[PDB]
Amino acid sequence: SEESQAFQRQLTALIGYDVTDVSNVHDDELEFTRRGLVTPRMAEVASRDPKLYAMHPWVTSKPLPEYLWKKIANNCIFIVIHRSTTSQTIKVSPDDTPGAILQSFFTKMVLRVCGRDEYLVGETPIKNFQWVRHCLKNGEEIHVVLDTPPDPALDEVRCDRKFRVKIRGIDIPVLPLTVFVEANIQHGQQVLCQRRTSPKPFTEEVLWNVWLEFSIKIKDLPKGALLNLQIYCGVQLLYYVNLLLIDHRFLLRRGEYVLHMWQISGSFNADKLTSATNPDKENSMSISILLDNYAEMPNQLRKQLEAIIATDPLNPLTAEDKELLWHFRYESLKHPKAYPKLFSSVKWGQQEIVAKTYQLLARREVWDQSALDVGLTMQLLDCNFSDENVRAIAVQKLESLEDDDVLHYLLQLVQAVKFEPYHDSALARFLLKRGLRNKRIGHFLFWFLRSEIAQSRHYQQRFAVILEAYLRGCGTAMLHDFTQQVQVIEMLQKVTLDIKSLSAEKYDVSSQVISQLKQKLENLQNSQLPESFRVPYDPGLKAGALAIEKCKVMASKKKPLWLEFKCADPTALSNETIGIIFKHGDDLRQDMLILQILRIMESIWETESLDLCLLPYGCISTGDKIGMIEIVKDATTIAKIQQSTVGNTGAFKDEVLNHWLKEKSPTEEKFQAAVERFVYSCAGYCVATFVLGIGDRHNDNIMITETGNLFHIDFGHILERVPFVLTPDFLFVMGTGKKTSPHFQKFQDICVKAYLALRHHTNLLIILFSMMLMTGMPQTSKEDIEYIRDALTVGKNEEDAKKYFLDQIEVCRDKGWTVQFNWFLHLV
Ligand SMILES: C[C@@H](Nc1ncnc2ccc(-c3cnc(Cl)c(NS(C)(=O)=O)c3)cc12)c1ccccc1
């Protein structure tokens, strides 16, 4: 109790929410969930190799791509091993395990990367480490240092009756029309049954005091069924709130309830699904209710069926389709691609059908046998699927994911916890397991959970319980890491928002500001700022002290901070400072998602030996409209390269890039590479942005490295037309008006390969894009979500798609500077 409450403070300061608080819950669910998550926490904590956990070797079973193979001579990889300053080069083969390399080092005469908490340990071949593959791709040498493994002790752990509901009335404290209440019984996002009250004049207190008798029987209520209470005006929806009709102990909800309701701001938004109630009881609308009750197959049908099974995830099912899928459900089980369609053809408001559906879930040889399809697995974890067991088979497949892929899918998986009916779920538990098993995963699980907790009232309660359960088993080592980080974030937060209000949005940075900033940065160091702190978007990097002279406020309207830090690691093999941008202004949950998709797109292209050279820079959301961003070194915008010669006077030149590239590459050998890198990076960002529908961008939101690597930024803003940015300046680097060239040919090659590669995972991209808009972008209608199928040319064959994209290139060359110039004209 003495140091159980001191701990519960520690946990609360990390989470950013008090889980033990019971001021905004009307049942035992959050607490029961906390209780429930001890077993799975301890099961994974107990079954945890102390040494492999402590060194968290980042490894992958995927094959070395063909583009990355073809920079190896004769099984030669030169690992430069260090000790104090006695550097020594060793040739090893791709199959050589790190242990063998140590055995043949002491002979011929544990590893850790230089400047990083990243170890090359365990029974894995050297080629199957991600740090190695990173160095190979960027064309760099693999310097390590031999030191003793860190102590694993540091990671120590501490009725046939119809359903009926009385609508007593609603209570809005202050109005500054007529209203009616609508009560829906929902499962997934299909309304089973629906009843409505009569309208009454809108007062601070309306009382109906009426029984809404539904048709559906009480026995036919499925688990995961919501009572969705909605208030309408007079017709517009004003407030909403949800209540699990079947509670977490399989008990029908009964008794008196006074629910504080969520407001509407004028869609598929996952906040609309939440079982949480509005915590702001003072200002929010309230509602008061009472629950008193307590063979063969014809060939033409097979082809109608297979036509349905083949269709995309956003292609709706007619009732004709659904009767067919249902009737031939045992035939539909043999195809895993049918499963979302099939379980969406179930009448969930009938006990008999659900029973049969559960018999259908008893009989799953093929699903279990089948290879992991994440696109298909993911479909079963969205808003459409409320059934505990339908969802749980999906999580089953996720079990077989390796840590590499879990990282790929972690953000979208954390978002999908919102679609879960109950706080305690297989997915919730899955995440807790994989975060406790792996520190890299657990580091990112922390911030992703903290992200939502910090700016989601609808889901902070559920997430906070999950985060608390992670924190209680992640090990004293990391509790300290997370503490140092949080401290540093919250400290640098104060500075950013305080500095932002010290100057007007119209006025730029002045003598007033730069002095004030540098003053505060000096105050913070000598106070209670930790020596080092692990960089959230790259937990390998320990960051040290502020290089205060290099820190500044950026001439923006958002006044973000350009911060630079010394590497706290002494064995770091350079003095290049760690650059981080702190920014209040935009919501970086949107950017995070977009970047996560970019990485998924890189891994899709890796399956077909393609490198399209994207820079998904690090970007974490830390709190409410605050986050930080990785600074890409030696990088500028396309706008500034235009300004460098011309000025701030439109009139865009074509040859101003090539000069900049020839200016910033010492050798012609490197210029060739800096054009090669540009042609890929450009093409990758052309394809990627087109499909996502964020291709039409200002060119100060497009950046480039001095090594030619192009990359888009600031997806917050975007979230007289052109598919994507392919300006005449880019085309001159390719070597073009309106004619072809050696490099522009390979641009169109690379592009088409990239476009067609993505279309091979049409269903994955569609389900991720849908989920992204539902969990991530409050700014969504069906037509927003059903944009992607058009961009991915669903239905069209291989050839029409190849031609569809080439046409989109020709809109860019026909528009030239017209659209980009209109973007500059948006300075009035
Ligand atoms: C732009 C800034 N420089 C940079 N240099 C390197 N890497 C960066 C990486 C990411 C970003 C970045 C990514 N997403 C967002 Cl939402 C933002 N938002 S903002 C613009 O800070 O308000 C920034 C900027 C970077 C610069 C200054 C002056 C001149 C030329 C560019």
Numbering used by the authors: 144 to 252, 271 to 319, 357 to 374, 379 to 436, 458 to 489, 496 to 523, 545 to 969, 981 to 997, ...
From the paper:
Here we evaluated the pharmacological profile of MTX-531 that was computationally designed to selectively target two key resistance drivers, epidermal growth factor receptor and phosphatidylinositol 3-OH kinase (PI3K). MTX-531 exhibits low-nanomolar potency against both targets with a high degree of specificity predicted by cocrystal structural analyses. Here, we show that MTX-531 acts as a weak agonist of peroxisome proliferator-activated receptor-γ, an attribute that likely mitigates hyperglycemia induced by PI3K inhibition. The reversed binding mode of the quinazoline core between EGFR and PI3Kγ was an important element in the design of MTX-531, which shows low-nanomolar potency against both of its intended targets.
Whereas the 6-position of the fused ring of NVP-AEE788 points out toward the solvent, this position in omipalisib extends toward the back of the adenosine triphosphate (ATP) pocket of PI3Kγ and the specificity pocket. We leveraged this flipped binding mode of the quinazoline core between EGFR and PI3Kγ to computationally design potent and selective dual inhibitors of both enzyme families. X-ray crystal structures of EGFR and PI3Kγ cocomplexed with MTX-531 confirmed the postulated reversed binding mode of MTX-531 to each target. The 1-position of MTX-531 forms a hydrogen bond with the backbone amide of V882 of PI3Kγ. Unlike the interactions seen with EGFR, groups at the 6-position of MTX-531 bind within a hydrophilic region of PI3K created by hydrophilic hydroxyl and amine groups of Y867 and K833, respectively. All studies described here were carried out with the (R)-isomer, which is ~100-fold more potent against EGFR and ~10-fold less potent against PI3K than the (S)-isomer. Collectively, the observed binding mode is consistent with these isomeric potency differences. MTX-531 exhibits low-nanomolar potency against purified EGFR and PI3Kα with half-maximal inhibitory concentration (IC50) values of 15 nM and 6.4 nM, respectively. The strong potency of MTX-531 against multiple PI3K family members and mTOR reveals a biochemical profile distinctly different from clinically approved alpelisib (Piqray) and copanlisib (Aliqopa).
